[PDB]
Amino acid sequence: NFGIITGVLSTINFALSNGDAYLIANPQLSARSGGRTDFLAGGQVPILQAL
Amino acid sequence: LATPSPFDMEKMVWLDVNILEIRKSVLENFGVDWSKQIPGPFAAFGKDFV
Numbered sequence: 001n002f003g004i005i006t007g008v009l010s011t012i013n014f015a016l017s018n019g020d021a022y023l024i025a026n027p028q029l030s031a032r033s034g035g036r037t038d039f040l041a042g043g044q045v046p047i048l049q050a051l
Numbered sequence: 052l053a054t055p056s057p058f059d060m061e062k063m064v065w066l067d068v069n070i071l072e073i074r075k076s077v078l079e080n081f082g083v084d085w086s087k088q089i090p091g092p093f094a095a096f097g098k099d100f101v
Contacts, residue, residue, distance in 0.1 A: 001099065004098060009093050010090075015088065
C-alpha cells in the first residue's frame, strides 16, 4: 500500500487599530515652612493583607 | 503664699471649611464593527499508487 493524503489550510487577516490618550493633572497645595501637607484625590480599594 | 488659678481661659477659634467638586463626562461609541479574521482557501490531495 503506497500513497499519500495531505492538504493545506489558511486564514486571512486585515486588522487595523489606532489609539490615543491624553491627561493633565494640576494639583496645588499650601504649607508653612517646616510643616507638611498631604493631598489625595482618588479612591481606596480593599486588599487582603494578613500575617 | 500666692496660688494659681484652676485653669487659664484660652481663646476660642471658629473654623469654616468649604469643599466644592464638579465632575463631567462624555461617552461615545459609534460606527460599524466588521470581522477582521476570516477563513481562507483550502486544497487537499490524495492518491493510492499501489
